[PDB]
Amino acid sequence: TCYEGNGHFYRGKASTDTMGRPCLPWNSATVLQQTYHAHRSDALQLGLGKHNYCRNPDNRRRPWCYVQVGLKPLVQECMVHDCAD
Template identity: 35%
Template sequence: LLSVLRSMNTCTYFCRDLRENYCRNPDGDSRPWCFTTDPSVPWEYCSLKRYCINGNGKDYRGTVAKTGNGRTCQEWSSQSPHSHKYFTPLTHPRAGLDKNYCRNPDGDVNGLWCFTTDPEKIWEYCEVPRCSTSPPVPAPGRQCLSGRGEDYRGKISVTESGNTCQHWSAQSPHRHARTPENYPCK
């Protein structure tokens, strides 16, 4: 099968599409990444965040940190003022429980929520804009992030800290073996 895929000029579902300097996940890491053009930063994870919600918002990764009533959200890793040992970055590592951002780690049908910094109010729902389009159907060449991003084919080429991605076929400023030639179907 590999020899057949290598002989094809078109990319199939199994190809990782190491074109240009777009963020990709060629080796099954936790999410898409790239080599950077910053000589002091060899590689970094890419910034592929959702800033609007579809459905219950379980895949939302934006930075809203206030509830619908204007309360500030408590950091997910903090146990003060409200103790909550079940919803932490350690217990839900794939739920995006970063800082104090609104999330939906339990799939609540009513949407995003957070613990609040108000000692009188344990948690509240957040208000985040709804996406104007429906979520994409699973298919090769997804333009948004799903799972670990192994099938992500969008054109984002900036890392989480703002570095520009190095072209996969380039060897400067960082030398590497993850080239389109070495990974024709990766």
């Protein structure tokens, strides 16, 4: 057990996810467009903060993020304390 739950404000300052793909701004003209951004007051209260990092916009077993790859934001969880046993 490493990530006890998903972790809201539990240090999610990584613009780099598991597949080594760079995580970005939540409030980005791209994610803000998507389904999980700074826009919905709760997202932030659930784990976001208009950062540019893997956090909890849902309740993933470990902080995740979308990663714009050639105009293609794709979610890949972050290589944090997720306990990939």
